[PDB]
Enzyme design. Structure first.
Site, PDB file in Angstrom:
ATOM      1  N   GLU B 164       0.835  -1.186   0.000  1.00  0.00           N
ATOM      2  CA  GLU B 164       0.000   0.000   0.000  1.00  0.00           C
ATOM      3  C   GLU B 164       0.866   1.232   0.000  1.00  0.00           C
ATOM      4  O   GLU B 164       1.333   1.644   1.056  1.00  0.00           O
ATOM      5  CB  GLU B 164      -0.906  -0.012   1.230  1.00  0.00           C
ATOM      6  CG  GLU B 164      -1.738  -1.294   1.381  1.00  0.00           C
ATOM      7  CD  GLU B 164      -2.981  -1.099   2.277  1.00  0.00           C
ATOM      8  OE1 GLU B 164      -4.137  -1.139   1.743  1.00  0.00           O
ATOM      9  OE2 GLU B 164      -2.792  -0.890   3.509  1.00  0.00           O
ATOM     10  N   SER B 210      -6.836   3.320  -2.463  1.00  0.00           N
ATOM     11  CA  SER B 210      -7.840   3.904  -3.355  1.00  0.00           C
ATOM     12  C   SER B 210      -8.382   2.971  -4.426  1.00  0.00           C
ATOM     13  O   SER B 210      -8.731   3.402  -5.531  1.00  0.00           O
ATOM     14  CB  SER B 210      -7.342   5.222  -3.969  1.00  0.00           C
ATOM     15  OG  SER B 210      -6.999   6.121  -2.932  1.00  0.00           O
TER      16      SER B 210
END
Lengths: 247, 247
Positions: B164, B210
């Site tokens: 991430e 996202s």
């Protein structure tokens, strides 16, 4: 006029459903003085379970929370969640949070402001370390910690201050009745002069740090000690004797 | 031989019993691909509730835990508690824990070793900050973070690595498919040379930051992306579309 005697148990990171179940059964069946306000601080994962099993006169507390209602804070819980499951208190500024997890006076103050705005009661912890006591600066340290809380408190009716010297937490080295009284008296005087006489006279200041069934009665007899925060002994039957310390 | 596609939802600090109940009702009734392993990461205070309400085919994860089974760690939970309520996973090293709460690689490694010893699965998170990426040291940073985890893993069968990039979390700046694939194949290559070929071919490496129903299909078709860790979109009905990203 008289402050209601207050005893909180902080279960810390202990318990499972079956062993906490047994503890809750003992507390529900026990004869607890009606003149003591009792609160149990359960691990977050068992807050719901504890509130569902505990008799209604015993309050439930979370052991920590964060400073906004929701958001991108993996691992945190908020006052809104605590209220949702029916808990009415949160413990903030515990020594383990300050010293193992690095929570600052600033962050703690922001947590206090937020928990109170959401309608929770707060048990706010303060206390000096051993090096601080030996250097003779106990007062300075606790006053500074207390100020950081007080700057974030509008309504004091839902605040309990817990004086817990760091050197007494979990070690077995309990403060003497005279050590505890001297600090509580000074803290109450600090409230008189920096907030109001009325807040000084109505705010519970509780002592924590190695409270047991064996030492609680002499501690409780001190004029400015309004109850206890109990860690290790809150997992034992003797928690009942601590709740009943004035009887 | 094929790695089972893995989609985790991290609810972060969001929800109450009403809103989470609705979400769960939706997931239990959804048309979910049989070839996807699904795990929901609930706030600690709702772990018990979520495990009781979610269909058994959907796994439940804690969003954090501490590194010993019990003790004087006010505010923490342990793998033994997580197991007790029937959750099978914990998320460790999430960006928010690293950067908001200051959890170090050393601490995360100890949590990983402890969680695995207790029989939990771990979703272990790594990723670089924007300034690291722009300075050309993505590889260095993710390899250093991955090594801190890997040196603490005896059995890889219950580990999922989550890449991430910090700059993509909650910002709407999703990595392009080619950005994610670059890092994932480098990580799989690191695993091949530092652990083994067998561990490189069977370990899921999932992407997060996202991910939405609109961008998930192109990410999912990359050769080394084995699924997703989903934040904001895991609170929405499109989470179902993400679960079904390969169909």
């Amino acid at each position: 006029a008289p402050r209601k005697f207050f005893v909180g148990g902080n279960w810390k990171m202990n318990g499972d459903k079956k062993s906490l179940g047994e503890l809750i059964h003992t507390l529900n069946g026990a004869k607890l003085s009606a003149d003591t306000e009792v609160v149990c601080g359960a691990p977050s994962i068992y807050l719901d379970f504890a509130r569902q099993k505990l008799d209604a006169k015993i309050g439930v507390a979370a052991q920590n929370c964060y400073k906004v209602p929701k958001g991108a804070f993996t691992g945190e819980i908020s006052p809104a969640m605590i209220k949702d499951i029916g808990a009415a208190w949160v413990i903030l500024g515990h020594s383990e949070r300050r010293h193992v997890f690095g929570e600052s006076d600033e962050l703690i103050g922001q947590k206090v402001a937020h928990a109170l705005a959401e309608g929770l009661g707060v048990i706010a912890c303060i206390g000096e370390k051993l090096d601080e006591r030996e250097a003779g600066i106990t007062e300075k340290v606790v006053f500074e910690q207390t100020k950081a809380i007080a700057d974030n408190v509008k309504d004091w009716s839902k605040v309990v201050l817990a004086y817990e010297p760091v050197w007494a937490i979990g070690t077995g080295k309990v403060a003497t009745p005279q050590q505890a009284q001297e600090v509580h008296e000074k803290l109450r005087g600090w409230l008189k002069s920096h907030v109001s006489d009325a807040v000084a006279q109505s705010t519970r200041i509780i002592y924590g740090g190695s409270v047991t069934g064996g030492n609680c009665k002499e501690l409780a007899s001190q004029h400015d000690v309004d109850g206890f925060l109990v860690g290790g002994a809150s997992l034992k039957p003797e928690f009942v004797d601590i709740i009943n310390a004035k009887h």
